[PDB]
């Protein structure tokens with residue numbers, strides 16, 4: 001049945017995403033452990049990750065379906081070992097750039113991790129499995145997050161020890177990915193027309209267009225929500241109050257993902273209504289936590305936004321997988337993620353980069369909320385016109 005591959009992939013996703021070093025990544029390599037200045041951290045180290053993510057997402061959707069989705073997952077586990085091995089025993093800027101390159105590899109293979117379970121289970125389970133997979137990742141995150149907090153609050157555990165235990169956690173993920181069942185088998189412009197034979201399936205462009213636009217704004221909000229929280233309440237002790245909140249926020253999203261799988265409600269009739277309702281919910285939450293002058297209301301707004309977006313993206317992924325009617329599961333997911341990454345990079349260059357408009361953090365979340373409201377109103381007007 002579907003139980004064994006789903007369980008193995010959920011174990012792999014949990015043990016590969018439960019990394020306690022994530023909330024304390026910058027403090028780890030901005031202190032005595034690595035002795036790296038913050039100037040090189042955000043200008044010559046982090047953008048390498050984005051460039052690697054784009055460059056390595058370019059071939060993932062091309063070649064994942066050919067290799068039947070397993071070697072790319074195994075490649076994620078291999079890159080997980082290399083990334084944290086270099087982050088453990090690597091000094092200087094040069095090692096960090098390779099670390100970000102391998103993390104871009106890791107995410108480009110996370111795309112294949114998402115596509116694999118649809119490549120191996122029958123379509124009837126495509127709903128249930130969907131939620132579970134997403135939920136697991138989210139769950140892993142919050143689990144790891146709280147673990148890190150505990151090891152800062154109840155163990156006095158150094159960041160190096162957090163990193164090595166995270167490497168051990170992703171080491172088990174590699175072993176679980178080794179045991180994943182293998183999916184069964186099955187003039188450049190011609191390939192493009194092949195895409196035209198895949199993106200015309202039961203208006204899958206609509207869900208894909210939402211994915212290509214909503215998740216870019218979601219990633220930007222994730223990147224800059226810590227900055228907004230620091231700006232709103234400039235407290236030196238807010239860090240413990242910040243990351244932990246993200247944890248529970250992620251947990252909320254997990255529940256939302258678990259909302260999709262567990263309940264048995266048709267989504268091919270409620271897909272448009274759910275999309276528009278939770279998109280206007282995302283817009284309202286983004287506007288709520290920008291305007292309110294209290295960090296608790298902003299925390300609630302962020303939790304609502306993250307949970308609603310996670311539910312929406314679970315629905316989007318399930319509906320794309322079901323309506324695809326072609327085996328190219330990682331091509332659609334890969335191209336959607338690549339287009340969304342391009343949009344996110346362009347809009348963060350326009351909005352945040354000095355070469356761009358360079359809006360302040362006060363107006364950054366206003367324009368994020370306006371962008372999400374525009375996205376919601378596009379589907380509001382389309383649904384009303386279609387009726």
Ligand SMILES: Cc1ncc(CO)c(CO)c1O
Nearest residue numbers: 022025046049083099100103
């Ligand atoms: C090594 C490494 N590089 C870049 C990022 C994204 O900020 C992450 C995610 O925290 C990461 O782990």
